[PDB]
């Protein structure tokens, strides 16, 4: 009962500058536990954020109710983030040793 | 030709009928008006006949059931034939149940013409003999 | 007038918050107290049952 | 609809307590009148301050500023600065809300 | 799938380089109103949703591209 | 041996509707279930100390069991089962003193045949049976700590 474009990651516009880390986590942590928060440093990106939820349904709910919230006298614009690209190589050696340790652990193959 | 395209071809048969505005007296189902037997295909193998009857009872009263099974092992081939008490339940089931998902698998439901029953020459099982001769049905 | 009316409304509003707040907190003590008492009576048919 | 309003009034009048009794010298009075020139005498400064009590001040500025226009028929034109322009789309709201203030004058706050 | 856990160093593959993570605080643990009169604010006038210049209308679902 | 055509239901059909990510859910809410009218609080006090005052009002039904991941109100101690109880608000038809009948939302407890069972006012209750819950009552889950007492807000 969800559309395919729903994501754990939220992109946030109209965020008042130099808001605290605590206030951020308190605002977004109501809907669920939070995997990670990234806040834009560079001045072109400054004032916007990405929030990753540990649960997909909480992120769904935070989009559904979070939008248009009033923080620091401004409306909050929330969207899903479309993770459409990858920025680094997937480091085959680490993934290889990790899979070897799992397969060694449970005698799979 | 993949089975999913057969499921889609029956559905497009219905949508096409709607677009053209065809009357029910000349609907495609009217070629199968004489029979009350419907083929169900693509079933999960975990489903037993109580499951099939449990779900396809939404549109009427099932008279007989033929979930064809492997001769040696007895496990399900995946397809069975159902006879309804009303012939119009076949229309309802082919329209409504074609292409639904059960345990993550889409099934196709199509009208079957001149269904020929299995011969009782084999003495392999007893409950199958009871099902053939008598069949599932409400008892007063 | 605007300035005066804001002050008046805010001060008047503020008093009601304090009144409500104290009632809230007073009622909270009564709940916990009532709770312990029933626990006490449990330590020492007018009901709905179903098939 | 308005004929149901008329019907309601008759029902409302008939069901007041002791309404038709006149043995002691009581009286009923029913006066129907109009607020004369109520649209024209609206003051746009006071209208702005009274709209700000009900809506975001941005909207109140938009409504009050929207009443301040040049009116022009043929070769003549003048600025409207006093009353409201009744042909705006939200004018009905203004009349009802401003009429509410006049009601509080005719009644009391208590009644 | 999307439900699956996401590792800390691979997640870095999902975002552009502009942003720096926050450290979670300690106080975070994972798991009517009446009549009031308003103060004037200019800030809602200041924020814009469209780019400035001779640029077309920017639909709301294109924001993260532009 | 060939598994000739049995005519009995199987869990496969059940797992298509009431199947949570952690595991298949034995209980499905009745049609008469409704969100509670008032605010009901559950008080937990492992002996003298008082633990966090729970707030039940939010949703129509709650599932209490060992699985912290499956259960709405987890109960950690081992004596409780995986699915232990359902706290269910349902509408019920009641007759008033005037003789007029009507609909009233009331809270109920239903225990899914847990091995240790549940004790209401120190009396264990029979599984698959709905029990209306009175104004003040104490709920005990097997041999575990923290007896629960329910109070609604207006009760004073």
XYZ file of C-alpha atoms in Angstrom:
633
model
C 0.000 0.000 0.000
C 2.926 2.305 -0.834
C 4.147 3.897 -4.075
C 7.531 2.663 -5.352
C 9.255 6.065 -5.018
C 9.105 6.162 -1.210
C 12.562 6.237 0.387
C 14.248 6.213 3.787
C 16.063 9.401 2.891
C 14.408 12.796 3.113
C 15.572 16.039 1.594
C 14.743 19.195 3.528
C 14.494 22.757 2.221
C 14.042 26.042 4.117
C 16.089 25.080 7.099
C 17.139 28.063 9.243
C 20.883 28.484 9.384
C 23.031 27.276 12.289
C 20.249 25.286 13.859
C 21.548 22.937 16.512
C 22.197 19.234 16.167
C 19.954 18.515 19.138
C 17.000 20.488 17.804
C 17.315 18.719 14.445
C 17.318 15.227 15.946
C 14.445 16.126 18.227
C 12.346 17.363 15.301
C 12.993 14.409 13.081
C 13.313 11.682 15.644
C 9.694 11.620 16.619
C 8.625 9.520 13.679
C 11.262 6.890 14.213
C 14.884 6.123 14.893
C 17.313 7.981 12.678
C 20.077 6.318 10.743
C 22.004 9.489 9.780
C 21.658 13.254 9.222
C 23.763 15.327 6.803
C 23.729 19.130 6.762
C 25.008 21.285 3.924
C 28.271 23.125 4.573
C 29.079 24.663 1.213
C 27.291 27.988 0.783
C 25.363 26.960 -2.296
C 23.936 23.973 -0.348
C 23.921 25.733 3.027
C 20.566 25.569 4.790
C 19.226 22.191 3.578
C 19.506 18.685 4.940
C 19.273 14.972 4.276
C 17.788 12.699 6.920
C 17.952 8.911 6.718
C 15.440 6.936 8.727
C 16.124 3.424 9.888
C 12.560 2.514 8.935
C 10.913 3.090 5.597
C 7.487 3.498 7.152
C 8.638 6.200 9.541
C 10.137 8.096 6.641
C 6.839 7.713 4.843
C 5.065 9.119 7.851
C 7.521 11.980 8.322
C 7.062 13.081 4.726
C 3.305 12.724 5.108
C 3.040 14.846 8.266
C 6.331 16.785 8.409
C 5.756 18.953 5.309
C 4.853 22.596 5.908
C 5.960 22.479 9.531
C 6.940 25.821 11.035
C 10.458 25.912 12.461
C 12.121 29.270 13.212
C 9.191 31.153 11.599
C 9.423 29.379 8.220
C 7.640 26.480 6.512
C 9.602 23.275 6.114
C 9.750 21.684 2.672
C 10.333 17.948 2.806
C 10.661 15.587 -0.119
C 11.941 12.177 -0.813
C 15.490 12.033 -2.013
C 15.902 10.071 -5.196
C 19.109 8.153 -4.725
C 19.676 7.842 -8.424
C 23.457 7.541 -8.565
C 26.501 6.123 -6.864
C 29.451 8.272 -6.021
C 32.150 5.649 -5.343
C 33.301 2.197 -6.343
C 32.008 -0.593 -4.194
C 35.464 -1.813 -3.000
C 35.413 -5.441 -4.064
C 38.097 -6.547 -1.627
C 36.147 -5.570 1.479
C 32.954 -7.084 0.133
C 34.913 -10.225 -0.767
C 36.340 -10.692 2.723
C 32.939 -9.938 4.236
C 31.240 -12.570 2.103
C 34.051 -15.016 2.856
C 33.561 -14.472 6.574
C 29.787 -14.984 6.299
C 30.125 -18.100 4.153
C 32.792 -19.432 6.506
C 30.498 -18.691 9.420
C 27.475 -20.616 8.234
C 29.084 -23.289 6.027
C 27.019 -22.201 3.035
C 28.951 -23.244 -0.025
C 5.174 -17.488 -24.827
C 5.243 -16.720 -21.157
C 2.214 -17.496 -18.962
C 1.966 -13.914 -17.800
C 1.156 -12.887 -21.296
C -1.724 -15.329 -21.244
C -2.985 -13.661 -18.095
C -2.635 -10.284 -19.811
C -4.345 -11.496 -22.960
C -7.501 -12.451 -21.112
C -7.497 -9.103 -19.322
C -7.059 -7.223 -22.570
C -9.931 -9.272 -23.929
C -12.088 -7.642 -21.250
C -10.725 -4.089 -21.595
C -11.090 -4.252 -25.353
C -14.712 -5.298 -24.914
C -15.330 -2.268 -22.712
C -13.760 0.119 -25.216
C -15.831 -1.202 -28.068
C -19.041 -1.244 -26.078
C -20.058 -4.848 -26.672
C -23.309 -6.109 -25.170
C -23.339 -9.019 -22.767
C -25.470 -11.200 -24.988
C -22.560 -11.182 -27.425
C -19.705 -11.067 -24.943
C -16.774 -13.438 -25.356
C -17.949 -15.411 -22.308
C -21.165 -16.224 -24.171
C -19.265 -18.804 -26.187
C -18.712 -20.702 -22.914
C -22.261 -20.298 -21.584
C -22.992 -24.025 -21.843
C -20.158 -25.072 -19.506
C -19.636 -24.470 -15.771
C -15.990 -25.537 -15.651
C -13.044 -23.190 -15.186
C -9.315 -23.777 -15.536
C -7.065 -22.316 -12.890
C -3.405 -22.225 -13.698
C -0.206 -21.135 -12.136
C -1.202 -21.958 -8.588
C 1.402 -22.222 -5.876
C 2.244 -25.780 -5.097
C 1.653 -25.309 -1.391
C -2.052 -24.742 -1.893
C -4.309 -27.658 -1.279
C -7.845 -28.098 -2.434
C -9.331 -26.644 0.696
C -7.487 -23.458 -0.131
C -8.735 -23.343 -3.721
C -12.308 -23.934 -2.625
C -11.905 -21.483 0.233
C -11.027 -18.636 -2.131
C -12.986 -19.392 -5.298
C -16.127 -19.690 -3.196
C -16.513 -15.920 -3.214
C -18.529 -16.134 -6.375
C -20.683 -19.120 -5.724
C -20.916 -22.699 -4.692
C -18.296 -25.102 -5.937
C -19.627 -28.436 -7.114
C -16.450 -30.286 -8.052
C -12.680 -29.824 -7.894
C -9.831 -31.396 -9.848
C -6.409 -30.274 -8.733
C -4.284 -32.480 -10.902
C -1.446 -34.117 -9.094
C 1.663 -36.034 -10.001
C 1.029 -39.746 -10.295
C 4.162 -40.940 -8.545
C 4.745 -38.428 -5.790
C 1.266 -36.978 -5.533
C 2.503 -33.404 -5.435
C 0.580 -30.738 -7.283
C 1.189 -29.911 -10.909
C -0.060 -26.402 -10.248
C -3.309 -26.500 -12.192
C -6.847 -27.613 -11.371
C -10.380 -27.493 -12.782
C -13.353 -26.201 -10.802
C -17.037 -26.690 -11.464
C -19.432 -24.109 -10.139
C -23.064 -24.621 -9.315
C -24.071 -21.552 -11.285
C -22.767 -21.141 -14.755
C -22.646 -17.380 -14.253
C -20.058 -17.756 -11.532
C -17.598 -18.653 -14.231
C -18.058 -15.211 -15.760
C -17.566 -13.611 -12.389
C -14.462 -15.622 -11.597
C -12.777 -15.231 -14.959
C -13.293 -11.506 -14.789
C -12.494 -10.940 -11.180
C -9.891 -13.518 -10.315
C -7.719 -13.617 -13.393
C -4.292 -12.414 -12.564
C -4.600 -12.041 -8.832
C -1.660 -12.941 -6.653
C -1.651 -15.724 -4.083
C 1.625 -16.189 -2.197
C 3.252 -13.902 -4.694
C 2.215 -15.755 -7.837
C -0.267 -14.636 -10.448
C -2.809 -17.173 -11.606
C -4.865 -17.413 -14.735
C -8.528 -18.301 -14.734
C -10.105 -19.205 -18.073
C -13.304 -20.857 -19.279
C -12.940 -24.531 -20.154
C -15.054 -26.086 -22.894
C -16.292 -29.692 -22.917
C -14.222 -30.704 -19.872
C -13.789 -34.475 -19.961
C -13.705 -36.256 -16.569
C -10.944 -38.667 -15.412
C -11.631 -42.382 -15.759
C -12.036 -44.484 -12.627
C -10.108 -47.405 -14.143
C -7.285 -46.708 -11.692
C -7.749 -47.941 -8.121
C -4.856 -45.826 -6.829
C -6.818 -43.913 -4.178
C -10.189 -44.048 -2.400
C -10.771 -40.389 -1.509
C -10.382 -39.503 -5.186
C -13.087 -42.063 -5.989
C -15.352 -40.395 -3.435
C -14.569 -36.990 -4.957
C -15.302 -38.167 -8.500
C -18.505 -40.097 -7.812
C -19.900 -37.777 -5.115
C -17.825 -34.581 -4.931
C -17.773 -31.726 -2.440
C -21.143 -30.201 -1.644
C -23.514 -29.049 1.081
C -25.488 -31.871 2.706
C -28.904 -31.227 4.245
C -4.396 50.246 20.966
C -2.776 47.346 19.229
C 0.145 47.356 21.582
C -2.103 47.595 24.601
C -4.374 44.844 23.402
C -1.501 42.452 22.780
C -0.176 42.971 26.268
C -3.561 42.462 27.796
C -4.355 39.346 25.835
C -0.978 37.812 26.551
C -1.072 38.486 30.262
C -4.594 37.293 30.522
C -3.789 34.212 28.489
C -0.764 33.524 30.603
C -2.758 33.359 33.789
C -5.020 30.685 32.353
C -2.022 28.556 31.433
C -0.845 28.620 35.019
C -4.286 27.755 36.309
C -4.678 24.879 33.892
C -1.169 23.684 34.550
C -1.673 23.461 38.279
C -4.959 21.634 37.823
C -3.196 19.274 35.455
C -0.478 18.523 37.924
C -2.866 18.216 40.841
C -4.998 15.776 38.910
C -1.909 13.774 38.022
C -1.111 13.130 41.661
C -4.649 11.953 42.237
C -4.306 9.438 39.403
C -1.155 7.848 40.726
C -2.654 7.810 44.178
C -5.803 6.107 42.935
C -3.621 3.627 41.073
C -1.710 2.536 44.176
C -4.929 2.149 46.081
C -6.374 -0.327 43.620
C -3.071 -2.189 43.668
C -3.462 -2.211 47.449
C -6.965 -3.616 47.154
C -5.687 -6.178 44.696
C -2.960 -7.197 47.119
C -5.452 -7.839 49.927
C -20.620 -9.711 38.133
C -20.954 -6.428 36.200
C -18.456 -7.566 33.565
C -18.625 -8.483 29.884
C -17.452 -11.929 28.815
C -17.469 -13.540 25.370
C -17.488 -17.000 23.780
C -32.850 28.575 1.655
C -34.450 31.919 2.487
C -38.043 30.659 2.785
C -36.889 28.165 5.364
C -35.408 31.106 7.209
C -38.788 32.799 7.236
C -40.359 29.574 8.481
C -37.743 29.255 11.207
C -38.444 32.783 12.426
C -42.151 32.065 12.873
C -41.299 28.897 14.773
C -38.733 30.830 16.786
C -41.257 33.517 17.682
C -43.990 31.083 18.573
C -41.775 29.158 20.930
C -40.559 31.961 23.147
C -41.894 31.608 26.655
C -45.237 33.291 27.412
C -44.981 35.128 24.167
C -48.559 35.967 23.373
C -49.742 36.753 26.871
C -50.634 40.370 27.409
C -52.641 40.226 30.624
C -50.131 42.128 32.698
C -49.242 44.626 30.015
C -46.272 43.070 28.285
C -45.383 43.992 24.732
C -43.617 42.424 21.803
C -41.858 44.634 19.301
C -40.528 43.483 15.952
C -38.456 45.958 13.989
C -36.987 45.227 10.572
C -34.524 47.787 9.296
C -31.413 48.185 7.275
C -27.880 49.305 8.019
C -27.859 52.350 5.814
C -24.769 52.960 3.709
C -22.738 50.397 5.591
C -20.562 49.564 2.603
C -19.690 53.178 1.874
C -18.750 54.220 5.375
C -16.172 51.485 5.924
C -12.837 53.076 6.772
C -9.954 51.264 5.167
C -7.490 52.005 7.946
C -9.757 50.625 10.622
C -10.721 47.807 8.280
C -7.089 46.842 8.045
C -6.672 46.819 11.778
C -9.793 44.736 12.200
C -8.873 42.247 9.540
C -5.512 41.722 11.202
C -7.306 40.230 14.192
C -8.638 37.439 11.997
C -6.076 36.663 9.285
C -2.333 36.653 8.525
C -1.328 40.294 8.195
C -0.152 39.651 4.648
C -3.653 38.682 3.589
C -5.106 41.633 5.453
C -2.793 43.979 3.626
C -3.775 42.422 0.325
C -7.499 42.871 0.955
C -7.293 46.403 2.220
C -4.894 47.458 -0.517
C -7.110 45.883 -3.091
C -9.944 48.205 -2.194
C -7.766 51.190 -3.107
C -8.156 51.438 -6.865
C -8.927 53.875 -9.608
C -12.508 53.626 -10.842
C -13.153 54.576 -14.425
C -16.218 54.841 -16.609
C -15.670 56.490 -20.000
C -13.641 59.711 -19.663
C -13.951 60.023 -15.859
C -11.862 58.330 -13.161
C -11.097 58.741 -9.487
C -9.416 56.885 -6.673
C -11.549 54.954 -4.245
C -10.214 55.601 -0.800
C -13.209 55.482 1.512
C -15.661 52.609 1.158
C -15.280 49.089 -0.142
C -15.661 48.077 -3.749
C -18.502 45.611 -3.561
C -17.601 43.810 -6.743
C -14.481 42.166 -5.468
C -14.600 38.438 -5.056
C -13.982 38.446 -1.333
C -16.192 41.441 -0.586
C -18.882 39.242 0.862
C -16.496 38.115 3.574
C -15.656 41.682 4.452
C -19.291 42.645 4.755
C -20.141 39.745 6.984
C -17.128 40.217 9.193
C -17.622 43.967 9.405
C -21.278 43.433 9.976
C -20.343 41.245 12.934
C -18.764 44.229 14.588
C -21.926 46.221 14.099
C -23.888 43.413 15.690
C -21.765 43.646 18.772
C -22.698 47.270 18.985
C -26.419 46.644 18.761
C -26.366 43.794 21.222
C -23.965 43.909 24.040
C -21.073 41.604 24.453
C -23.149 40.006 27.171
C -26.325 39.396 25.216
C 16.030 -4.341 -0.266
C 15.286 -0.812 0.886
C 14.533 -2.434 4.235
C 18.081 -3.820 4.486
C 20.645 -2.113 6.755
C 23.014 0.392 5.230
C 26.678 0.433 6.184
C 28.380 3.653 7.233
C 31.109 3.702 4.595
C 28.873 2.568 1.742
C 26.242 5.164 2.619
C 28.883 7.742 1.788
C 28.457 6.458 -1.746
C 24.878 7.767 -1.704
C 25.401 11.470 -1.207
C 27.308 14.266 -2.914
C 30.446 15.552 -1.254
C 28.937 18.840 -0.064
C 27.598 17.564 3.212
C 29.060 16.511 6.576
C 27.328 14.067 8.915
C 26.142 15.015 12.274
C 27.098 13.165 15.411
C 24.007 11.918 17.218
C 23.464 13.518 20.599
C 23.305 11.556 23.820
C 19.831 12.687 24.837
C 18.549 11.124 21.679
C 17.896 7.486 22.262
C 16.439 5.564 19.346
C 13.163 3.762 19.855
C -6.651 23.895 21.610
C -4.923 27.244 21.394
C -6.837 30.397 22.123
C -6.952 33.806 20.630
C -3.568 35.394 20.200
C -2.599 38.528 18.377
C 0.159 38.335 15.800
C 3.452 40.133 15.310
C 4.447 41.472 11.880
C 7.102 39.399 10.091
C 8.818 40.069 6.792
C 10.366 36.634 6.476
C 7.617 34.829 4.589
C 7.841 37.514 1.913
C 11.579 36.932 1.653
C 11.646 33.232 0.812
C 11.197 32.371 -2.862
C 10.334 29.108 -4.529
C 11.328 30.016 -8.078
C 14.671 30.913 -9.617
C 15.349 34.539 -10.349
C 15.630 35.724 -13.901
C 14.103 34.669 -17.159
C 13.805 31.053 -16.124
C 10.686 28.913 -16.466
C 8.401 27.701 -13.731
C 10.125 25.215 -11.489
C 7.782 22.395 -10.597
C 7.991 21.170 -7.006
C 9.176 17.697 -7.845
C 12.137 19.018 -9.820
C 13.671 20.838 -6.870
C 16.452 18.424 -6.215
C 17.567 18.601 -9.808
C 17.629 22.368 -10.061
C 3.221 -42.609 0.036
C 1.342 -39.924 -1.912
C -0.422 -37.061 -0.115
C -3.836 -37.825 -1.739
C -6.295 -34.909 -1.777
C -6.825 -33.732 1.795
C -9.668 -31.204 2.210
C -8.428 -29.085 5.091
C -7.170 -25.538 5.383
C -3.448 -24.850 5.477
C -1.446 -21.978 6.892
C -0.550 -20.825 3.377
C -3.855 -19.017 2.920
C -3.494 -17.415 6.354
C 0.008 -16.101 5.652
C -1.314 -13.910 2.829
C -3.196 -11.483 5.096
C -2.064 -11.459 8.742
C 1.636 -12.019 8.203
C 3.960 -9.501 9.846
C 7.577 -9.137 8.757
C 8.816 -10.892 11.880
C 6.204 -13.704 11.741
C 2.588 -14.721 10.986
C 0.138 -13.038 13.370
C -2.396 -15.365 14.978
C -4.907 -12.644 15.821
C -6.966 -10.527 13.434
C -8.990 -7.604 14.754
C -12.785 -8.051 14.799
C -15.021 -5.760 12.724
C -16.431 -4.138 15.882
C -12.994 -2.815 16.900
C -12.803 0.967 17.134
C -10.363 3.605 18.388
C -11.120 4.309 22.077
C -13.331 7.233 23.024
C -11.380 8.212 26.162
C -7.726 8.113 27.202
C -6.702 4.949 29.055
C -3.381 4.751 30.895
C -1.544 1.602 31.916
C 0.573 1.865 35.050
C 3.595 -0.429 35.530
C 5.302 -0.730 38.920
C 7.817 -3.506 39.474
C 7.117 -3.583 43.226
C 7.698 -0.229 44.968
C 9.301 1.646 42.047
C 7.020 2.999 39.328
C 7.921 2.527 35.659
C 6.876 4.758 32.691
C 3.133 5.459 32.587
C 1.982 3.990 29.265
C -0.719 5.672 27.162
C -3.049 3.235 25.434
C -5.546 5.655 23.785
C -3.721 5.908 20.452
C -4.910 2.822 18.545
C -7.737 0.300 18.609
C -5.773 -2.855 19.466
C -2.469 -3.731 21.112
C -0.486 -6.975 20.913
C 1.615 -7.970 23.922
C 4.297 -10.629 23.634
C 7.951 -11.580 23.833
C 8.936 -10.209 20.413
C 9.963 -6.598 20.947
C 9.901 -6.366 17.149
C 6.399 -7.794 16.686
C 4.638 -6.594 19.851
C 3.147 -3.145 20.375
C 3.820 -3.401 24.130
C 6.854 -5.658 24.640
C 7.195 -7.596 27.894
C 10.759 -8.814 28.193
C 10.797 -11.386 30.976
C 11.052 -15.000 29.779
C 7.784 -16.186 31.328
C 5.811 -14.325 28.636
C 5.160 -15.882 25.241
C 5.795 -14.613 21.721
C 2.143 -13.648 21.251
C 0.603 -13.368 24.711
C -2.407 -11.052 24.769
C -4.454 -8.571 22.767
C -5.875 -5.487 24.463
C -8.856 -4.658 22.263
C -11.257 -1.729 22.305
C -14.519 -2.785 20.708
C -17.926 -1.218 20.325
C -20.604 -3.156 22.221
C -24.374 -2.736 22.413
C -25.531 -1.758 25.908
C -28.937 -1.019 27.415
C -29.368 2.053 29.602
C -31.695 2.568 32.565
C -34.319 4.044 30.227
C -34.356 0.777 28.266
C -32.924 2.429 25.160
C -30.072 0.484 23.593
C -26.987 1.971 22.011
C -23.332 1.678 21.119
C -20.529 2.147 23.644
C -16.811 1.602 23.112
C -15.294 -0.545 25.852
C -11.868 -2.112 26.445
C -11.432 -5.873 26.559
C -8.608 -8.331 27.105
C -8.197 -11.519 25.084
C -5.397 -14.005 25.731
C -4.211 -16.160 22.830
C -3.856 -19.337 24.878
C -0.447 -18.455 26.312
C 1.250 -21.286 28.190
C 1.767 -19.327 31.399
C -1.506 -17.454 30.945
C -2.665 -14.088 32.260
C -4.210 -13.261 35.628
C -6.916 -10.603 35.921
C -7.370 -9.642 39.575
C -5.195 -12.677 40.427
C -7.586 -15.043 38.591
C -6.361 -16.687 35.396
C -8.659 -16.307 32.387
C -9.597 -18.860 29.741
C -8.016 -18.537 26.278
C -9.946 -17.376 23.190
C -12.485 -15.636 25.409
C -13.082 -11.889 25.445
C -13.216 -10.327 28.910
C -14.562 -6.855 29.577
C -12.184 -4.757 31.647
C -13.502 -2.767 34.589
C -12.562 0.697 35.755
C -9.725 -0.540 37.984
C -8.039 -3.883 37.301
C -4.611 -5.486 37.636
C -2.989 -7.436 34.798
C -0.330 -10.099 35.359
C 1.591 -11.793 32.538
C 2.800 -15.210 33.617
C 5.454 -15.080 36.309
C 6.989 -11.742 35.287
C 7.231 -8.519 37.284
C 5.403 -5.203 36.770
C 1.689 -5.618 37.428
C -0.320 -3.231 35.251
C -3.275 -1.130 36.429
C -5.514 0.749 33.982
C -7.103 4.149 34.652
C -8.830 6.524 32.299
C -8.206 10.248 32.539
C -11.536 11.450 33.919
C -11.559 8.876 36.725
C -11.286 10.951 39.897
